[PDB]
Design a protein around this nucleic acid. Structure first.
Lengths: 17, 144, 70, 208, 78
RNA sequence: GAUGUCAUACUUAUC
């Protein structure tokens, strides 16, 4: 389930604070 | 229905199993029964679309260690732990120039991802099972 | 079959002194295995290049003289 | 009396033409001089076989006939196929009634079109040299490439569009060639972007 | 030392296609493709023997990112 | 692949 959730998350919404 | 009798380019018959030639049609039907033909026959997407995104502002606490980030996240009420991943700055929404660094981004399902740029080449390890932890009682995730 | 092994030259002992005195059960099989990876690996240890002059070479002392003559 | 192949290879000036069967002849030096001549032709390979050079392609499928462009450009093949398809459906009574009162004018396309196809539209075929003999597997051995060039099938398989812009044009082994250097087996090979200009050398490789 | 093993290739790839793919990094002296004679299909592996061991090592090091028909081709020393 | 019996088919503008 963690591998399925990690492979479906958006990796383009980057936010630097 | 014999799958071995074929027609050649000269108007003849050819047995492909025993590889024999026959001139007339009466010689192909008499070549199926015999000692050679009998011996030849005996020898032969849903999780990504359902992700809610309100994007709240996260609060990270970076600290230079010596031998680590302490990001406080709210209650997610799920078994899925937040995951960290190292990505390159070549892919972006606007593609700004001079992007030649890497960014370690931590992401969770009810919150937005928080990214930290790493100018150095290799000073740590961004693996999940190797050097990260998440205390579900205090809702605190750490990675070193 | 004994007839297909007697007509095609099979079951005939042939000795190859280059590949560790290996055995071969056919003249055409020996001629096919001469231009193969095993004979090239056996001839590469002596330092002879894989060419067409050493196709019918069997003894190492004759192959060394054929390599020194060229 | 009969020497081995080693002495025959050492005695002859060209040991590449020496075979295993030439040592048991009646003249090894004469056979070695005749086999290593300038304009001599080799013997066929079916002299030592046992299939009489024609019993190997039994079960193999072959096309009936390859018509040239000059004969196919006259419309005689389609008319002959239509006449064969019309004659294959006629019975014996229709074939015997057409012999006493035949219908003239089956095709009759032209008279000068055949002369134009045989005199004006004549094309020279693909001949060969006199030394290139014919064998049984010569019709199937068609595999007999250049460094720096890629075919259309290899580019379709690898997924590399051939373009004049040398940014996306080279294969992805160009980064390894930039990090490691030129190939040691080809010192004169030049690739665009490393040792060649990019808009100039659009052929993705040059042997200079 | 002069032979490198190539794996991860599809069955539709041919030996002249593999030779033309290997010729871009160096001249290959021999190419062996093990295939079953009963079915006439390749086994997905091949051996490219070059003229030198250093050229074979450079070809093995320069082919770690080659993809053929959607499958990445791996090169190893053999 | 060879042998010896049988049948089919083909070639030489053969008669």
């Amino acid at each position: 389930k963690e591998r399925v959730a990690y492979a479906q998350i958006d990796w383009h919404d980057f936010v630097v604070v | 229905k014999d799958p071995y009798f074929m027609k050649n380019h000269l108007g003849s018959y050819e047995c492909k199993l025993c590889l024999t030639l026959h001139n007339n049609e009466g010689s192909y039907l008499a070549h199926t029964q015999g000692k050679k033909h009998q011996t030849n026959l005996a020898r032969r997407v849903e999780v990504k679309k359902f992700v809610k995104i309100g994007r709240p502002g996260y609060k990270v606490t970076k600290q230079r260690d010596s031998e680590l980030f302490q990001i406080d996240y709210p209650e997610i009420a799920e078994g899925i732990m937040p995951r960290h991943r190292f990505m390159s700055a070549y892919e972006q929404r606007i593609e700004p120039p001079d992007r030649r660094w890497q960014y370690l981004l931590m992401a969770a399902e009810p919150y937005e991802t928080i990214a930290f740029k790493v100018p150095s080449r290799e000073i740590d390890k961004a693996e999940g099972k190797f050097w990260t932890h998440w205390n579900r009682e205090t809702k605190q995730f750490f990675l070193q | 079959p004994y007839w297909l092994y007697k007509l095609h030259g099979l079951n005939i002992n042939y000795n190859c002194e280059i590949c560790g005195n290996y055995t071969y059960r056919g003249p055409k099989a020996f001629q096919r295995h001469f231009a193969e990876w095993r004979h090239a690996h056996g001839m590469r240890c002596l330092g002879i290049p894989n060419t067409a002059h050493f196709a019918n070479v069997t003894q190492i002392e004759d192959a060394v003289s054929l390599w020194a003559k060229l | 009396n009969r020497f081995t192949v080693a002495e025959l290879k050492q005695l002859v000036a060209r040991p590449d033409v020496v075979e295993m069967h030439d040592v048991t002849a009646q003249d090894p030096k004469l056979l070695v001089h005749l086999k290593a001549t300038r304009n001599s032709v080799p013997v066929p390979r079916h002299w030592c076989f046992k299939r009489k050079y024609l019993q190997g392609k039994r079960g193999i499928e072959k096309p009936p006939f390859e018509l040239p462009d000059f004969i196919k450009r006259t419309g005689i093949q389609e008319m002959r196929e239509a006449l064969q398809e019309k004659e294959e459906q006629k019975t014996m009574k229709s074939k015997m009634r057409e012999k006493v009162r035949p219908k003239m004018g089956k095709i009759d396309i032209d008279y000068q079109k055949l002369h134009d196809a045989f005199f004006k539209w004549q094309t020279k075929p693909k001949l060969t040299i006199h030394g290139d003999l014919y064998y049984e597997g010569k019709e199937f051995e068609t595999r007999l490439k250049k460094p720096g060039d890629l075919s259309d099938e290899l580019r379709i398989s690898l997924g590399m569009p051939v373009g004049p812009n040398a940014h996306k044009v080279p294969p992805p082994w160009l980064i390894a060639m930039q990090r490691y250097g030129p190939p040691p087996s080809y010192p004169n090979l030049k690739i665009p972007g490393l040792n060649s200009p990019i808009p100039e050398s659009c052929s993705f490789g040059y042997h200079a | 030392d002069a032979t490198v093993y190539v794996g991860g290739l599809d069955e539709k790839v041919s030996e002249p296609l593999l030779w033309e793919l290997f010729l871009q990094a160096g001249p290959v002296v021999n190419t062996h493709m093990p295939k079953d004679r009963v079915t006439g299909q390749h086994q997905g592996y091949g051996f490219v023997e070059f003229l030198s061991e250093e050229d074979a090592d450079y070809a093995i090091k320069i082919m770690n990112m080659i993809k053929l028909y959607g499958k990445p081709i791996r090169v190893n020393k053999a």
